[model samples]
Target: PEFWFFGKIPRAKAEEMLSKQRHDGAFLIRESESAPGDFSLSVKFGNDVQHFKVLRDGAGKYFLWVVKFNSLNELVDYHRSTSVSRNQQIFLRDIE
Candidate 1:
């Protein structure tokens, strides 16, 4: 998400960075309800690479278990239960 005012750069420079992003420079950002495959995507733009996405299996689930992805079309350095999570709250606890 580039600011049109301050913290702005040349249009050409901005476009160059957008070219490297995945999903055609666009990330999923729509949530699905009462079903599976709820997701959101956005271009990282070399700034906010963390907490980029949240995958939801919807249907009134409270956990909102999700996974994150970066601009490179890859999961951002994190292990998450993206589909129909478990009863446990400990993240990365079952593994070493």
Candidate 2:
């Protein structure tokens, strides 16, 4: 997956950027290289943002995980994985 980040922006602009599209559907993400101001996708459960930690084996291929947490920093679950192909738009008529 391609990684994109917004380096800097004003509060109004940030809101506008976030308001552009709300990815409510299942999202597929991959490990991104470390950067000073890199933007990582986060899910707000109650107070904390759920961020995934990437680790590579001896071969050096980074591992992916989906960490589930409670609002109180409790580890509900960890190391979940997913797959992706294309961003399919859901049309209501298609369900019929």
Candidate 3:
């Protein structure tokens, strides 16, 4: 597993980790608390953190918005080079 994937951690714990970074783009992927089979992408931007639901389609594809990816790694790698949101240039960065 990748360092960015903090599997099974609660939202509070994820928030704590990202807060420590005190910068934009500090993020990690965690198992969703509300959805058993899905994942959550927690990203820190400015002073606030946003959590995007990473859902899987019937064909086993993962996606947050319109773009779909084969795996979490690929989704994240794409975001590292591209903006996650259109409103702002929010790129993903590991918490470390």
Candidate 4:
């Protein structure tokens, strides 16, 4: 659960870095009732939980980008290598 640009990378590299891939879920910010204009993003895993806030417009444009993998070291490696900017708060957590 980290936010790096997995957008245009190689899957083979991803395969090397990521241990396993499974499950995808998200909360949408479509409307005031369905989703607030601003809200907290809570992610819980094994024995840890992380929280971040999504305070932006169109709310619909906001989403939770999630991935399942097994190596924190590899994930960190990916994060460091591929991350273009550190301008936003990216909430990344893991579950088993």
Candidate 5:
């Protein structure tokens, strides 16, 4: 299992965890409350924490933005190496 994946955690909890890390780009994945069966990506950026929904397409492909993946792990891995936000250069870093 991926260490960054936190199953069924609420948004508040995810925020708390990311804030505790106190590092820009620190992130984690949790089950989405807004959309069941989907996921949420909580990322720390500067003084604020941002949340992005990870939605699954009709074909069972996962995606947060433009890029799509076959699995959650692929999506996470891609973001870890690539920047998510273009303006701020938000690269994901798993909380240690």
Candidate 6:
């Protein structure tokens, strides 16, 4: 089986994820390099923001996880109450 990593996220999927920050106001993100094959992506949240480090090991295993959490607990609570409008199996026609 093949694995899909964050960097390979399709624009549509990225947009879907970004929509989650709506309640938090404006959302923004950018990519930066830390070292060879080492990089990170940061997102701007309403009250704070978050960062994720991208990693690729020798075994070709990939790891993308939260490296920094601004207002971590608060964001956790925010996400807990958040909901999505569209999903893998849902369509607007179904709701209409």
Q: Best TM-score goes to which candidate? A: 3
User: Could you tell me the lDDT of residue 25 within candidate 1?
Assistant: 22
Q: What is the C-alpha lDDT of each candidate?
A: 0.30, 0.29, 0.87, 0.32, 0.86, 0.34
- Sort by lDDT, best first: what order? 3, 5, 6, 4, 1, 2
Question: How would you encode candidate 3's per-residue C-alpha lDDT over 40-64 as one tens digit per residue?
Answer: 9999987778788897888899988
- Name the lDDT of candidate 3: 0.87
Q: What digit string (tens of lDDT, one per residue) describes model 4 on residues 47-88? A: 332333333334333322343224333433433334212444
How many residue-pair clashes does candidate 3 contain?
0
Q: Model 6, stretches more than 4 Å misplaced?
A: 1-31, 65-96
Worst 10 residues of 1 by lDDT: 87-96
Comparison by TM-score, 5 against 6, better one:
5
lDDT of 2 at 42: 27
Question: What does candidate 1 score on TM?
Answer: 0.21
Clash totals in order:
7, 0, 0, 1, 0, 0
lDDT of 6: 0.34
Please state the error at residue 95 of candidate 5 in Å. Answer: 0.3
TM-score of each: 0.21, 0.28, 0.91, 0.24, 0.91, 0.31
Q: TM-score ranking from best to worst?
A: 3, 5, 6, 2, 4, 1
lDDT per residue (tens digit) for residues 1-96 in model 2: 122233343334433443434442222222234533222332322222234333334544343333223321122112112221123222111000
After aligning candidate 2 to the native by TM-score, how far in Å is the CA of 53 from where it should be? 0.3
RMSD to native for every prediction? 13.6, 12.2, 1.2, 13.9, 1.2, 12.2
Number of residue pairs clashing in candidate 5, backbone atoms closer than 3 angstroms, sequence gap of 3 or more or interchain:
0
**Which scores higher on lDDT, 3 or 4?**
3
Clashes of 6: 0
